[PDB]
Design an enzyme around this catalytic site. Structure first.
Site, short mmCIF file in Angstrom:
data_model
loop_
_atom_site.label_atom_id
_atom_site.label_comp_id
_atom_site.label_asym_id
_atom_site.label_seq_id
_atom_site.Cartn_x
_atom_site.Cartn_y
_atom_site.Cartn_z
N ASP A 1 0.66 -1.21 -0.05
CA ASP A 1 0.00 0.23 0.19
C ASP A 1 0.67 1.28 0.08
O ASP A 1 1.20 1.72 0.99
CB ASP A 1 -0.82 0.02 1.20
N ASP B 1 -2.31 5.59 -5.25
CA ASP B 1 -2.45 4.76 -4.09
C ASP B 1 -2.71 3.43 -4.58
O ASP B 1 -3.77 3.20 -5.13
CB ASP B 1 -3.81 5.21 -3.18
#
EC number: 3.4.23.21
Length: 325
Positions: free
Chosen positions: A35, A218
């Site tokens: 992430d 992201d």
């Protein structure tokens, strides 16, 4: 695989991508979600009281290199999910690179969404300015300081479920077989701890659906989330209808759709027609783009699975190029 190379597994229809990471001595293999939207490395542990029976749990007693830490942690993500626990220290092996004494966060409690998920935790690749605990050095921080990578970068390829899925992260380098043409360098604004960039404009056909807007790269987010007005403008271009929950209903037949093209630092990058459809359920298709009450966009997997990105934490900057396919 090569040094620093970590093959990824594509979960579902491009929902998320996780890779194996070995933690401890002799060590256990864990499936973590990579992430770039967060900076904490946490994993389910045997101290957890509401974790999933399907998750692999870190057991302090089974690692000879475990070192207790008197600090606690708590995190809350944008999608509402959360987790909390205690800190610890141990060795983490990332694609053959052994990071020694990495601060890891053992969960004692996690949201149901995590307990039912396919991963055992998260590996944060954002900047260290947003670690939930002050003083914690991120994996990339340690890869650099311990000399495990000569260049402060990692290349990211996220495959498409329709093409066999998969994906691959390369720490300390990148793979040119995964993209076509020359890479375009784009400056990064890390003032908020994220990989922020500026998109000059967005077009669908000859129509400019949006002017310049800021967004963050992201990998931890599935869709392309756009600010209210921008999302509405894009939606009108594809005749999608607002579901009222941040998502849109779009035609399942993308054969007539033109790609969503982003102009970034003078180059064109797109979300292919097929990527405009995220999921199909009982004859209804949900769009790959949604909206949030933010002033910036969250450039998630919908975009990333169409464009190879080299993250450079040192400058910081990113290099982007269309994926090869």
């Amino acid at each position: 695989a090569g040094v620093g190379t970590v093959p990824m597994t594509d979960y579902g229809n491009d929902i998320e991508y996780y890779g194996q990471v070995t933690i401890g001595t002799p060590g256990k293999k864990f499936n973590l979600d990579f992430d770039t939207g967060s900076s904490d490395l946490w994993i389910a542990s045997t101290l957890c009281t509401n974790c999933g029976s399907r998750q692999t749990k870190y057991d302090p007693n089974q690692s000879s290199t475990y070192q207790a830490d008197g600090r606690t942690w708590s995190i809350s993500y944008g999608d509402g999910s959360s987790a909390s626990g205690i800190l610890a220290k141990d060795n983490v092996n990332l694609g053959g690179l052994l990071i020694k004494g990495q601060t890891i966060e053992l969960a004692k409690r996690e949201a149901a969404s995590f307990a039912s998920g396919p991963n055992d935790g998260l590996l944060g690749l954002g900047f260290d300015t947003i670690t939930t605990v002050r003083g914690v050095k991120t994996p990339m921080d340690n890869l650099i300081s311990q000399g495990l990578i000569s260049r402060p970068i990692f290349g990211v390829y996220l495959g498409k479920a329709k093409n066999g899925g998969g994906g691959e992260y390369i720490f300390g380098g990148y793979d040119s077989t995964k993209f076509k043409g020359s890479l375009t360098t784009v400056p990064i604004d890390n003032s908020r701890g994220w990989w922020g960039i500026t998109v000059d404009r967005a077009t669908v056909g000859t129509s400019t659906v949006a002017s310049s807007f800021d967004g963050i790269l992201d990998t931890g987010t599935t869709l392309l989330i756009l600010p209210n007005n921008i999302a509405a403008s894009v939606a009108r271009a594809y005749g999608a209808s607002d579901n009222g929950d941040g998502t849109y209903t779009i035609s399942c037949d993308t054969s007539r759709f033109k790609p969503l093209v982003f102009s970034i630092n003078g180059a064109s990058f797109q979300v292919s027609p097929d990527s405009l459809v995220f999921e199909e359920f009982q004859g209804q298709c949900i769009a790959g783009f949604g909206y949030g009450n933010w002033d910036f966009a969250i450039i998630g997997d919908t975009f990333l699975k169409n464009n190879y990105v080299v993250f450079n934490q040192g400058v910081p900057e990113v290099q982007i190029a269309p994926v090869a396919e």
